[PDB]
Ligand binder design. Structure first.
Ligand SMILES: Cc1cc(CNC(=O)c2cn(C)c3ccccc23)on1
Ligand SMILES: [Zn+2]
Length: 140
């Protein structure tokens, strides 16, 4: 579990969105595994605006933050899971690291801020849904 809290927005994995998230929907994209809902209180997280390929991610199944190198956001084939059939997921970055289904929502960050959240995994790889291209998260 986990979310990004920026301005009056809550960014979560679309497959973990609650009824309250859907009832207060701002934007959602199934191909990116992202859903954004509105909040009453303002958030503390800052979004990175860069093309970094190194950062640190939070792994709840180890209670640890790990430094990783990750690929640029791309269209990648993801194996079938409890939440999606086997399909191509867009704006996805991969790194070598541990992850389990429940690690979804853990933040990946760099020197400029939040880069994305854990979304996929298996076979010693961890995949992150990028949010750096969503410029509207900083305004409105
Ligand atoms: C132990 C162990 C090792 C693994 C292997 N990781 C996985 O299967 C998954 C890791 N993440 C972040 C996912 C998201 C959606 C669906 C599956 C996964 O799972 N349990
Ligand atoms: Zn950066």
């Amino acid at each position: 579990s986990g979310a990004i809290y920026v301005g009056n927005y809550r960014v979560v994995n679309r497959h973990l969105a609650t009824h309250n998230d859907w009832a207060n929907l701002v934007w959602e994209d199934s191909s990116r595994d992202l859903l954004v809902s509105s909040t009453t209180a303002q958030g503390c997280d800052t979004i990175a605006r860069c093309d970094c390929q190194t950062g640190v991610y939070y792994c709840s199944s180890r209670r640890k933050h790990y430094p990783v190198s990750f690929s640029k956001p791309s269209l990648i084939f993801v194996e079938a899971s409890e939440y999606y059939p086997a399909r191509y997921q867009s704006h996805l970055m991969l790194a070598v690291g541990h992850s389990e289904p429940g690690d979804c929502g853990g933040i990946l960050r760099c020197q400029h801020g939040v880069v994305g959240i854990v979304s996929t995994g298996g076979n010693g790889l961890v995949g992150f849904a990028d949010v750096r291209d969503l410029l509207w998260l900083d305004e409105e």
